[PDB]
Each structure stands twice: as structure tokens, then as C-alpha cells.
């Protein structure tokens with residue numbers, strides 16, 4: 087999803103889905119850091 | 124635990140409506156030899172509700188007199204009698220689809236079914252403690268209603284009236300409701316979702332199909348709530364817009380045409 | 386004439402069920418039936434990941450996805466499965482190592498042994 | 514944004530570690546033989562009933578059991594939503610020679626279901642009504658047009674020889690007072706009722722999710 091941690095931490099989501107949500111969020115923070123630099 | 128003070132709440136709220144006199148203008152009591160072979164268009168017009176209080180002769184009802192299903196096709200419901208309205212039929216499990224098929228041959232689309240869960244009177248009495256006349260049956264129904272705070276511990280599945288049937292035990296009665304749209308731009312006003320599609324009734328084991336008083340009143344109030352302008356109020360209403368077939372010979376409900384098979 | 390329902394179910398799963406629904410002997414593959422539909426890791430997918438690590442440097446997952454998975458795979462799942470295969474949760478030091486299929490078991494055993502030695506063996510993964 | 518953003522970076526590290534181990538643990542349990550909630554003697558089919566070779570199913574059932582299905586339950590996707598014609602075109606005439614059909618029907622498709630039972634050679638003989646129950650025990654009244662729908666009707670038709678050794682008569686109940694367990698998720702009691710009707714028989718479910726997989730059931734679905 088996005089910066090909303092509660093959406094990516096849903097119990098309905100499975101661990102693979104949750105984990106790829108965290109990895110997409112990680113990519114977003116990396117992109118924001120690259121935009122900062 | 125079973126919430127029967129709420130499932131059977133209506134048995135403490137709804138009162139039987141008093142029967143109107145035959146010499147009164149609020150009822151139309153008509154007597155016919157055979158309802159299925161009688162021109163009903165002479166006994167009412169522009170109907171909105173037609174509740175056929177049909178008691179069927181089915182193999183489940185052992186050695187009990189009732190209407191034959193094959194005669195229902197002989198019934199005539201012309202557009203003059205009912206143009207745009209709702210028809211109510213007591214349905215048994217072995218002649219369910221046939222009824223629907225018959226109702227398809229007379230322009231009545233299936234729109235609803237109203238099901239009565241049946242709670243065993245003897246089972247409820249045994250849970251309280253541990254041929255019967257209708258006065259006695261009503262007496263123990265009221266006794267069960269009064270003693271409902273101590274019956275809540277018993278599971279609801281042990282109270283269901285599981286009567287004999289070839290395939291699945293009969294713990295339900297059905298009132299199929301059909302509609303006739305008829306002409307266009309003639310809107311049948313309906314107050315929607317004002318009655319539960321399922322009800323619970325404590326019944327006797329011998330004849331669950333023959334619905335007793337205080338519960339036929341539930342069906343009457345469902346019909347009158349579903350079709351508001353079909354209710355006959357004197358002064359600005361020329362004709363009665365409700366009519367019931369095979370009605371009780373002593374209880375003529377006001378606002379209805381009482382058709383008695385005599 | 387009773388019917389052996391275990392054998393009957395096994396034979397029917399052999400006949401009219403997917404290769405992921407049942408196993409080779411007809412036994413019900415429970416691995417398929419506790420992950421979401423369309424997210425199951427087949428043994429063919431494991432062999433494809435092993436062949437992709439042999440063919441391409443481990444760490445570059447777009448190439449593996451477009452070559453040995455026909456583009457229908459998750460990069461996250463590929464990274465997690467290579468972490469399982471190497472036995473180490475963090476594969477940063479294994480970036481583009483290009484490890485062969487017949488050799489990867491040695492590093493898996495080495496990481497598992499380091500997990501026992503350093504008391505970091507949490508569920509068959511060297512928690513470094 | 515700004516410093517707390519990389520603070521979130523530490524956060525998006527920490528969780529992505531912990532969940533990782535959790536996933537690994539689950540997969541490790543997958544490696545060391547973890548049983549699923551579905552039973553062992555379940556026969557799942559993952560195919561669309563439009564494209565599924567029913568003749569293969571018929572031949573497999575003939576060569577593995579020697580007899581056709583005894584109960585065929587069905588929860589059709591009424592208008593993925595299959596049309597009425599495509600649901601009707603399903604070859605239930607060949608999937609059953611002597612037994613019962615247990616097809617669920619919403620109100621809007623109540624009549625056509627009675628048509629389908631009539632068009633498949635069955636004769637409609639029963640109805641089982643599932644009254645939806647709330648968590649407290651009350652009636653789960655839904656939404657309707659004429660009445661507040663608080664029921665789901667499963668129409669039961671019968672086809673042929675029933676007075677044989679199987680198909681116990683006068684069993685169970687025609688009413689299931691069970692709770693609502695999910696979206697379009699049928700009660701489990703009907704399965705028990707089916708086991709009350711036909712003990713240790715062969716049964717078929719045409720539109721079955723993963724929760725409808727039971728013992729001695731040949732379930733069909735697309736998300737199975």
C-alpha cells in the first residue's frame with residue numbers, strides 16, 4: 087500500500103503479501119532518499 | 124441463550140383482531156361450493172392481496188382431509204379480480220415446485236417465501252419440566268410463553284419440531300408470495316422490509332400445517348404491512364382490496380373478503 | 386462391498402486433479418492448501434529458482450523473473466526463497482555470487498552449521 | 514518526511530526482518546509436513562465448469578467407485594458469475610443416476626432453480642432453509658424488497674432408485690439455524706445432514722471454495 091502501516095499489517099493478508107508490501111514500502115523510502123539526494 | 128424472548132416476542136405483542144359481523148360493511152363473506160371452480164371475479168375486484176389459506180392433502184399429513192394440488196390449476200384468477208397484486212399460498216414440501224409451476228401458468232412470478240420455524244410444544248414443555256384440544260394447546264402455548272426465561276438454557280436445536288417426512292424432517296411451514304405486475308404505470312405501493320422473512324412459532328405436533336390463531340394474525344399483519352393502501356378504511360374506499368380463500372367460518376377479518384368453502 | 390475411501394480419493398486425485406493439488410502417489414498436497422490461491426511455490430518453481438541462480442547472479446531478480454519464471458513471479462518471493470536456499474536471512478554478502486545447483490547445498494550446510502555454532506539457528510535460517 | 518522518514522526506514526527494516534522469520538517458520542513447517550485444514554480424503558478440482566471435461570470425471574468415478582454420485586450439492590455463481598443457461602448446460606444428467614441434488618438458490622434465482630431441477634430429470638421433493646444467526650443468537654435479518662431476507666434456500670431434488678441400501682429416510686432437519694461464517698459461506702451442518710441422508714457415499718460439489726472440502730467429496734471450483 088503506502089506509508090499507512092495498519093493497511094499493510096492486516097491479519098487478512100498472508101505473510102507473503104505482507105512482506106511484499108513492506109518491500110514495496112522499502113522501495114518507496116529508497117526512492118524518497120534518492121529524490122532527496 | 125437461545126434468545127427465545129426475542130424470537131417469540133411477537134406472541135406477546137400481536138393481539139388477534141376481532142372478527143367483524145356478517146351484516147357489516149367492513150367484511151364481504153361469500154360462501155361457495157368449491158373455491159377452485161368458482162368465479163371469484165364476482166366476489167371482488169381490483170385486488171391487491173389474495174391470501175389462499177390452503178390446507179393441502181399431502182402424504183406428509185397422514186390421513187388428513189385437505190385440498191388436492193391438481194385442482195389448483197382449475198382456479199381462475201382473471202385480471203379483473205387481480206390486476207397488479209400479491210398472492211399468498213400455503214406450500215407443502217412435496218408440492219412446492221408444482222405450485223410455482225401452476226403460478227407460472229396464471230401470470231404469477233415468484234417473489235418471496237415466508238417460512239415458519241416450528242418449535243415443538245411437547246419439547247418446550249419437557250424442557251420446562253425437566254388428541255389435545257385447541258384450547259389446551261393455546262393454554263400450554265401461553266404457559267411456554269410465560270415460562271421463557273428458564274427455557275433459554277435449552278439449545279434451540281433440541282426444540283425444533285422434527286416431524287415425519289420421507290426425506291428431511293418437517294420443521295418448517297412455507298407461505299409462497301407471488302406477484303402479478305399486470306398493467307404498466309399502475310404502481311402497487313409497498314412498504315418494504317417491515318416484516319422478517321423468517322418467523323418462529325411454538326406449534327403442536329399433530330397438525331403443524333394448520334396454523335392456529337395469533338399466528339395467522341402474524342400473516343395477516345405481514346400482508347397488511349406489505350400492502351398499505353390495500354387496507355380498507357371507510358369513507359374514501361369503494362371496494363375491498365384484500366380477499367382470502369378458505370377462510371375460517373367464524374373469524375371474518377375486517378378489510379378482507381372472506382371466501383368460505385361450504 | 387465397502388469402498389476404501391482413502392484409496393478411492395487417492396485414485397481420483399491421481400486422475401482428475403492438478404499436479405499441485407495432489408502429489409505423485411495421489412496424496413493430498415497440503416502445501417497447496419494453506420497458501421492463497423495463485424501464490425503457491427511449486428517444486429518446479431524451486432527448480433527454476435535454482436537454475437536461475439546457476440544461470441544468473443543471485444540478487445538480480447528481474448532477469449530470473451523474465452527468463453526462468455516467464456515473468457509471472459514475485460521478486461520478493463524470489464529473494465525469500467533464495468534466503469531459504471542459502472540458509473541465511475540476509476543475502477547482501479551473496480550479491481551476484483552465481484552459485485551452481487550442485488554447490489548451493491554446501492553453503493546452505495555451512496550457514497546452518499554457523500547457526501548452530503553461534504546459537505542463531507532460528508527455524509533452519511542463520512539469523513545474521 | 515525528513516528525519517523521521519529514515520526513522521520509518523529503521524521501522525520498515527525491523528518489521529521486514531520479523532515477518533521474514535515468521536514466513537520462514539511457516540515454510541519450515543511446510544517443509545516438515547504441516548497438515549492443512551482440508552481433510553486427506555478430499556478430492557479437489559481446480560477448473561472452470563464451462564471448460565471441465567466432465568466425461569473424464571464420469572469415467573474416473575466409474576473406474577474408481579463403480580457407481581455415480583449420490584449427492585450433488587451446488588452453490589451456483591448467480592448473476593465470476595455464470596449465466597443461467599451456462600449453469601443449466603452442466604451435464605448433471607450424466608453425473609447422477611439415482612440420488613439427490615442439493616442446489617442452493619438465492620431468492621431472485623429461486624424459480625429458475627426449480628426449473629433446473631425439473632430440467633435435469635430430478636423431481637423437487639425437499640427444501641432446507643438456512644436461517645442466518647448472529648453471534649448472540651438472534652436472527653440475522655438482511656435486505657430485501659418485500660421481506661427482510663434472513664434465509665437461504667437449498668432445494669433438494671431426487672432422481673431415481675432411493676430405497677436401496679443407501680439413502681436413509683426421515684433424517685436430520687429441513688432447517689439449519691447456524692451462524693453467518695463468511696461471504697456466501699454455507700453452513701457445515703448441511704454436510705452433516707448429507708451424511709445423515711447418505712452415509713459413506715460419494716458426493717459432488719460443483720462450485721466449491723476451499724472451506725467446502727470435506728471427506729469423500731469430489732469438489733469442483735476455480736479457486737480450489
Ligand SMILES: C[S@@+](CC[C@H](N)C(=O)[O-])C[C@H]1O[C@@H](n2cnc3c(N)ncnc32)[C@H](O)[C@@H]1O
Nearest residue numbers: 561562588589590593697698699720722734735
Ligand atoms: C456462491 S459462491 C460459492 C460459495 C461456496 N459454496 C462457499 O460456501 O464458500 C460461487 C463460487 O463458485 C466458484 N465459481 C465461480 N465461477 C465459477 C465457474 N465458472 N466455474 C467453477 N466454479 C466457479 C467460485 O469459487 C465462487 O466463489
